[PDB]
Design a binder for this molecule. Structure first.
Ligand SMILES: CCC1=C(C)/C(=C/C2=NC(=C\c3[nH]c(/C=C4\NC(=O)[C@H](C)[C@H]4CC)c(C)c3CCC(=O)O)/C(CCC(=O)O)=C2C)NC1=O
Ligand SMILES: CCC1=C(C)/C(=C/C2=NC(=C\c3[nH]c(/C=C4\NC(=O)[C@H](C)[C@H]4CC)c(C)c3CCC(=O)O)/C(CCC(=O)O)=C2C)NC1=O
Ligand SMILES: CCC1=C(C)/C(=C/C2=NC(=C\c3[nH]c(/C=C4\NC(=O)[C@H](C)[C@H]4CC)c(C)c3CCC(=O)O)/C(CCC(=O)O)=C2C)NC1=O
Ligand SMILES: CCC1=C(C)/C(=C/C2=NC(=C\c3[nH]c(/C=C4\NC(=O)[C@H](C)[C@H]4CC)c(C)c3CCC(=O)O)/C(CCC(=O)O)=C2C)NC1=O
Ligand SMILES: CCC1=C(C)/C(=C/C2=NC(=C\c3[nH]c(/C=C4\NC(=O)[C@H](C)[C@H]4CC)c(C)c3CCC(=O)O)/C(CCC(=O)O)=C2C)NC1=O
Ligand SMILES: CCC1=C(C)/C(=C/C2=NC(=C\c3[nH]c(/C=C4\NC(=O)[C@H](C)[C@H]4CC)c(C)c3CCC(=O)O)/C(CCC(=O)O)=C2C)NC1=O
Ligand SMILES: CCC1=C(C)/C(=C/C2=NC(=C\c3[nH]c(/C=C4\NC(=O)[C@H](C)[C@H]4CC)c(C)c3CCC(=O)O)/C(CCC(=O)O)=C2C)NC1=O
Ligand SMILES: CCC1=C(C)/C(=C/C2=NC(=C\c3[nH]c(/C=C4\NC(=O)[C@H](C)[C@H]4CC)c(C)c3CCC(=O)O)/C(CCC(=O)O)=C2C)NC1=O
Ligand SMILES: CCC1=C(C)/C(=C/C2=NC(=C\c3[nH]c(/C=C4\NC(=O)[C@H](C)[C@H]4CC)c(C)c3CCC(=O)O)/C(CCC(=O)O)=C2C)NC1=O
Ligand SMILES: CCC1=C(C)/C(=C/C2=NC(=C\c3[nH]c(/C=C4\NC(=O)[C@H](C)[C@H]4CC)c(C)c3CCC(=O)O)/C(CCC(=O)O)=C2C)NC1=O
Lengths: 172, 70, 162, 160, 97, 44, 172, 162, 172, 162, 162
């Protein structure tokens, strides 16, 4: 598994080199913003259930076919599987966010996922949408939390978004 | 001793000892490599009911339970 | 019992390995963090009495019907066992604060929660609402990293119940 | 483009570009800014052009917009002007490319089969395009109006 | 015991190689003691980081569940119900259960 | 052969759940990206 | 598994109580001395091999019977087992030292150990001695290391000793 | 690749669990520790050239016979491959410093070490003595927690080779 | 698994026949040369480590890219992986040589091997070369050993070569 | 296919190990033994015709009733398939002699024997009696270690059928 | 303890099977081979004293520096423990010769070798050079199949140490 430092190290090694002063300071900056990062990961963990629930309510509000017989979130067994997948993806997105690298998300979650869903008959476009809704709400929470010091988290909100967007793209 | 490192919860930390005597069930001759039917397993507290369930499920006789960790 | 210390030790042991710089760095986090944690712990400890009575009442104010006869917020024994239960939660929150991890919550409240609540006809909604209220008031007893810690664990209980 | 056309002929005969081919690239690129201005003017008046084409069309063929007509009704007429908007767009592309490659792959190859299926009268689509020539051409200088006009007459030609 | 250990490392770890630093040595002092059996030793290997890094840490749940069937049970998955039962257990109770 | 990850595709899946459930029978989501709207009145 | 905090918590809970101001400050002090503790654990980790080696050289210097035929550290197989056990015990002593509690040592290492050795014919008194030698050298290292800030580590040296002494007592 | 961050994530994932206060406390340790680590890294990085030549020579001064003909410290190619190898070690030490764990050392030097050294007739003693020397000189390039970090990883290599 | 006799038997059975006097004497000759065969297998076993080592030294002498970063025998684990594969192949070649048949080599070692290496990014041409070097040295040893009775081993040296050449061909 | 050679190779492979003096000593046994084995093989090979007709008849002489109508020793096809079957056994005996082990017998006659015989109503007693007779006559075609070898394998078949 | 006899018995037992002609052929190899083995054993046994002193010295002659002060070939105790160790090797070689397999070597010297040598700072190179020398001199004490046997086991130790 990689994190943002480990990634630097792998690229340096492929040159046969000690880390460039370029790369050093990029990593010094990651340490600089790490308290914000911890709050951002904490924002997701602290509202995981609601993020999934709210995404869910809204997914089925839009796509009332999934909860009809014939639909891929019917009966209870399938809805529980769908709720479970929402949690799994939100989980690996939070891991990537602590790590500063998408690899755990791509390697443990996204790799093969689309082909799984197609084999199953699970409508990937609906799954992509559920991921887009989780993103909206998750970032909502990253941006408006309990008595965190006031500052600018937009860099981290972007990065979190790209992890949500990776997952969506990979699946649709 | 036992299996050693367990789960990190306190309810995984307690390992117990079971001496059994498995019996030949029914229905079939075992011609493979057989073992003497006494033995003992050390099982952590978190697992224990599946293990005792499959022990008494296969015609076994639980002879002793011992508190070895706790 | 899950703490930063027990976790790194567990991970070393399971690879048959001495603690190395990775594991000691981790431990320093837990030790550096103790001050904020333990401030939250002391504030939650001395306000316990009122935090509990505040949350108990709020369960009845949000679920008015509970306090009518034939219901589970009626009579001395239900209302007594309620205060006690919220007190258990606050107690384990302080323990988790002091311990440096969710262990006390995981081992004494989370493991088994739903089975128990389901057999005894206890709705999680009450308990979430008790905790949401406790979270509101702890906003003005603490601030900075002690508040973040208090929040971390209160929210952890709310997610355990959803 | 002029580039694509020249090159494809070069590569297919396994050779470098001819003096002729080089000359036309040079004359073409010199007209770049002018061609870009011609596209801008027309892009800037697109909503007006489609409309005046649409009036000119329904006078000349009130039947298309009649009981047994392909464009009969408010939303059968809405789609008809949208198709006129499509072709004006392709005409701006052609003018800036200096040939039809793009215009052709996007909107003439297969157009007979498409419209035959929809039962759209092809020759009245050709009329809608003449109508657009007339409007667009009245918003351009003589020299630029001719240069634009070649591409309008091409589309009119291809629907044939 | 060396012949047994070699067959265990061939089967459970899926013919991938363990280096001399990666050897779980202190389980073998006990397996030579006889305090655990072969089944408990297989369970201890499959919960360790040798199995976890290779077959769990970089794969999806389908690859991981079908690799459990190949390593531990020695056979292939039979239907979709075997996979949809096991992953529900994984999400409910974690990797150790 | 082995189930190693150090190749170019570290643990891509095999026996895909297109194997485990076999044939399919009926459905495609019959969705409408066809469009509807505008209203004028008269003359027909 | 317990650490020094977890131990406090278990005793508090058995009273049905929030931690006593007594217990709180005992734990505040453990946090106070934690940098020293990290150096002490680091002293052992950083010299593990030499601690085992030096203990070993000295054990067999004293007890030349173990390395004769008939002896419990003969032939190579048995010596490797004995060297391995020295490492295992030093390892759980270092874990206890990071934790501030002996429980991991008692529960995962010492529990049953004596009866194992007796079953095996391993002379427990010799094993106890090997543990006493590891203690001498380990503490040596805890007390005289590379450019650590000067101060008093005797409290921690004592506590480390009791873990070595627990193991010895448990085994002999 | 073992870092504090990857370790806590691995432990969460394997229990199917979001990162909680235990795991985030751990991460803070790794981030709080980065300054000392990275100072050690910069000092080891710019002195690399001489640290390597110093240790290479010390291998010959401690094992004089290596530099005689028919031996493995003789001729340009042996002496070249030696400098390179110590340079590999210092490189991975800096990586481990920057990464917040032993991962780079574990994955690129420790995994396989003995098999390789045994096939190629390379004695660990040389490498330990190279590292002991590097440890002597790093005593005056750094101090405080940067030195402790440098030491942690140098010693980690020496234990890997014993 | 087949040996040279077993192979005869399978072909006879496919005719429904007792072994032909043709096949009988071919096998009588294998028994005739079997002491030499045992010395030949013994030559490889007795120098396995050096055969691998010497092949190795020479492989990396030629292909200095493999031991640079980016190279498939870098860092230490990859080199360790490459060094047994050398051992694994030398091992199955010696088995084939005791057996008088290539099947164990083809079935347990060579089958799928090329596709493994390509999946891994392991340069097959380099692996083929390492096998060619093992062959040179192995045969060297088969031909010039410790106080073996003097005679002609060229038939066996050829046969050993074809096993090395099978492996090379199969892999490149 | 089980031979001394395949067995020792299997045992080496399964421990990831080159053939050593233990395994080569074993192989020498198999090679030293080939002469006696192959003499038995040649004698059984050329007498096959009569050994088969002798044993076939003996099955009818020991089980007279088999040759009456409605029975399984009656008509050309039963009596033909019988000769064939004994011929199969002698064939695999010669193969086992030549191969240096029971492999050919194990793989082509023993694996599955009882299931087949039970489905087809073939009594092992016949086959044992065919083999007992073949054993009687092979007493005067061979002697010494070739006879011991022939016996070893005939007896092996008789035990497989009991 | 690995011998031809124990190996074939192990293989029978593990298939729940009586010893058959395959396994007895194997055993005959081990018994036929005993004469050469045991001649090697007797020669190595009576020359032990000098074979050991010859190899001990050769370790110092090939690694001259070992015999200087502060080194591991200096003082009575190192030089005593060395002779002993080579004597252990020759002893187990004779045992392996007599036993008909590598068992005694595998169980008493190979299992654990590297761990021990690594903890005690003993270089295999010495031991290989002791054995290479013993191999040189055993060239003129034996010949034919006794020499081949002696060689087989000496070489087996050298490969165990590489
Ligand atoms: C238990 C693990 C752990 C956490 C969670 C942690 C959080 C943490 N967040 C901090 C700051 C902060 N955190 C934020 C975060 C935000 N600002 C906003 O306006 C957004 C709504 C939000 C975006 C994510 C900001 C702006 C600061 C102050 C600037 C800084 O220190 O970087 C600080 C510095 C002290 C302070 O200023 O309060 C800490 C210690 N430390 C830890 O050890
Ligand atoms: C290590 C090799 C080995 C041995 C020796 C062995 C003995 C053994 N005999 C057993 C049973 C048995 N053994 C017998 C034997 C006899 N009954 C009589 O009346 C006679 C006196 C005697 C035959 C001469 C019987 C009848 C049982 C079944 C007992 C029962 O289930 O009631 C069982 C219980 C498991 C089973 O039934 O398969 C074992 C383990 N198992 C082994 O693995
Ligand atoms: C160590 C941690 C721990 C927890 C958290 C815990 C919860 C818990 N609550 C219980 C009962 C109860 N819990 C309540 C709760 C409430 N009643 C109200 O007025 C409110 C609606 C609400 C408080 C918000 C009630 C009324 C009962 C009695 C249920 C019964 O026995 O019918 C019981 C059943 C045993 C008993 O009757 O005491 C358990 C185990 N037990 C524990 O050991
Ligand atoms: C749970 C962690 C754990 C421990 C503590 C452990 C102890 C342990 N020590 C053992 C052997 C051994 N232990 C020693 C130790 C010693 N010999 C001496 O003379 C000294 C007094 C002492 C060293 C200080 C020796 C020599 C053996 C091998 C005994 C033999 O096989 O003859 C064995 C038998 C298995 C084996 O040899 O690998 C176990 C299980 N095993 C474990 O898994
Ligand atoms: C590596 C982490 C990981 C992921 C991501 C994962 C996905 C995954 N989702 C599955 C099923 C499923 N996934 C869903 C999800 C949905 N249904 C819908 O209609 C929605 C569009 C969507 C929810 C947003 C459903 C309904 C099934 C059950 C399909 C069936 O059995 O018919 C299955 C089959 C096994 C099972 O049912 O447990 C896998 C492996 N498994 C994993 O181990
Ligand atoms: C990577 C994990 C990690 C370690 C190892 C760590 C060590 C560490 N040891 C420290 C102090 C110290 N460490 C010691 C230790 C000793 N004094 C002696 O004379 C004895 C020889 C030795 C006994 C163990 C002392 C006396 C201090 C200064 C007092 C104090 O800060 O408590 C400090 C405070 C800064 C300083 O004064 O240098 C740190 C950060 N911090 C970490 O995050
Ligand atoms: C990524 C981490 C990594 C390490 C650590 C590494 C070590 C390493 N050292 C090697 C060789 C070598 N290493 C040395 C070492 C030395 N010679 C001397 O003068 C001194 C005594 C000593 C330095 C202290 C020598 C002489 C060789 C050549 C060995 C040979 O091929 O004969 C080789 C064999 C391939 C080659 O010839 O380059 C490896 C793999 N390789 C790696 O990829
Ligand atoms: C422990 C297993 C085992 C082995 C290894 C074994 C070897 C062995 N090799 C032999 C002969 C021999 N071995 C060779 C071998 C060679 N000649 C050369 O010049 C080449 C360098 C080498 C090629 C491989 C030759 C030429 C003979 C004499 C001719 C013969 O007997 O076939 C003999 C017959 C006696 C003798 O003449 O010395 C034996 C017993 N016997 C065994 O039971
Ligand atoms: C490769 C080794 C091999 C063996 C050993 C073998 C036995 C064998 N014997 C068979 C039938 C038979 N076997 C016999 C045997 C006999 N009839 C008599 O007159 C005597 C009593 C007796 C000879 C002693 C008979 C009569 C049948 C015909 C059974 C039937 O189809 O009804 C069949 C059924 C297929 C068929 O009808 O040919 C098998 C497979 N097949 C094999 O492939
Ligand atoms: C049963 C088979 C068996 C073997 C093979 C064996 C080897 C062995 N050699 C040892 C020590 C030793 N081995 C030597 C070897 C040598 N010193 C020299 O002068 C030469 C360089 C070299 C001989 C070639 C030395 C000097 C020691 C003492 C190491 C120490 O304790 O510092 C020890 C440590 C215990 C002790 O001090 O005796 C073992 C176990 N032990 C066994 O039980």
């Amino acid at each position: 598994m990689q994190d943002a430092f480990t990634k630097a190290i792998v690229a340096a090694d492929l040159r046969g080199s000690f880390l460039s002063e370029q790369e050093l300071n990029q990593l010094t900056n990651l340490v600089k913003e790490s308290n914000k990062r911890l709050d951002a990961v904490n924002a997701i963990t602290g509202n995981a259930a609601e993020i999934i629930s709210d995404a869910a309510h809204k997914l089925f509000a839009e796509q009332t076919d999934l909860i009809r017989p014939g639909g891929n979130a019917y009966p209870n067994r399938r809805m529980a599987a769908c709720l479970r997948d929402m949690e799994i993806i939100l989980r690996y997105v939070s891991y990537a966010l602590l790590a500063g690298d998408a690899s755990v998300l791509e390697d443990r979650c996204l790799n093969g996922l689309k082909e799984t869903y197609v084999a199953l008959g699970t409508p990937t476009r609906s799954v992509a949408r559920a991921v887009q809704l989780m993103k909206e709400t998750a970032i909502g929470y990253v941006n408006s939390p309990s008595g965190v010091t006031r500052g600018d988290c937009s860099a981290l909100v972007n990065e979190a978004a790209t992890y949500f967007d990776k997952a969506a793209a990979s699946i649709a | 001793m036992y299996n050693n490192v367990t789960a990190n919860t306190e309810w995984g930390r307690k390992v117990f000892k079971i001496t059994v005597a498995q019996f030949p069930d029914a229905d079939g001759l075992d011609t493979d490599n057989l073992s003497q039917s006494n033995y003992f397993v050390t099982v952590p507290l978190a697992r224990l009911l599946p293990e005792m369930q499959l022990i008494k499920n296969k015609g076994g006789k639980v002879l002793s339970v011992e508190p070895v960790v706790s | 019992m899950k703490t930063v210390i027990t976790e790194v030790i567990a991970s070393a042991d399971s690879q048959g390995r001495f603690l190395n710089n990775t594991e000691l760095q981790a431990a320093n986090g837990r030790f550096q963090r103790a001050t904020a944690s333990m401030e939250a712990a002391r504030a939650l400890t001395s306000n316990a009495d009122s935090l509990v009575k505040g949350a108990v009442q709020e369960v009845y104010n949000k679920f008015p019907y509970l306090t009518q006869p034939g219901q589970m917020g009626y009579g001395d024994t239900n209302q007594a066992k309620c205060a006690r239960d919220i007190s258990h939660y606050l107690r384990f929150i302080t323990y988790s604060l002091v311990a440096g991890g969710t262990g006390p919550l995981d081992d004494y409240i989370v493991a088994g929660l739903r089975e128990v609540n389901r057999t005894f006809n206890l709705s999680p909604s009450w308990y979430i609402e008790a905790l949401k209220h406790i979270k509101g008031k702890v906003g003005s007893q603490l601030s900075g990293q002690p508040l973040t810690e208090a929040n971390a664990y209160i929210d952890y209980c709310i997610n355990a119940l959803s | 483009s002029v580039l694509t056309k020249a090159i494809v002929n070069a590569d297919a005969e396994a050779r470098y570009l001819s003096p002729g081919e080089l000359d036309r690239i040079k004359s073409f690129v010199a007209s770049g800014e002018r061609r870009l201005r011609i596209a801008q003017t027309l892009t800037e008046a697109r909503e007006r052009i489609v409309k005046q084409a649409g009036d000119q069309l329904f006078q000349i063929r009130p039947d298309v917009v009649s009981p047994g007509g392909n464009a009969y009704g408010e939303k059968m007429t809405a789609l008809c002007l949208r198709d006129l908007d499509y072709y004006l767009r392709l005409v701006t592309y052609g003018i800036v490319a200096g040939d039809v490659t793009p215009i052709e792959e996007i909107g003439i190859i297969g157009v007979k089969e498409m419209y035959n299926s929809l039962q759209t009268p092809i020759p009245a689509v050709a009329e809608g395009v003449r109508a657009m020539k007339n409007v667009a051409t009245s918003l351009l200088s003589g020299d630029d109006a001719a240069e634009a006009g070649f591409y309008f007459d091409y589309l009119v030609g291809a629907m044939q | 015991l060396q012949g047994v250990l070699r067959a265990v490392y061939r089967q459970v770890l899926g013919n991938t190689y363990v280096m001399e630093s990666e050897r779980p040595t202190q389980a073998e002092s006990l397996l030579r003691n006889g305090s655990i059996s072969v089944r408990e030793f297989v369970r201890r290997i499959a919960k360790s980081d040798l199995y976890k890094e290779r077959f769990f840490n970089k794969a999806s749940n389908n690859r991981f569940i079908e690799l459990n069937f190949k390593h531990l049970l020695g056979r292939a998955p039979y239907n979709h119900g075997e996979i949809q039962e096991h992953f529900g257990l994984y999400h409910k109770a974690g990797y150790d259960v | 052969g082995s189930d190693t990850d150090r190749g170019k595709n570290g643990q891509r899946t095999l026996v895909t759940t297109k194997d485990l459930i076999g044939p399919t029978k009926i459905f495609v989501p019959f969705v409408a990206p066809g469009r509807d709207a505008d209203m004028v009145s008269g003359d027909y």
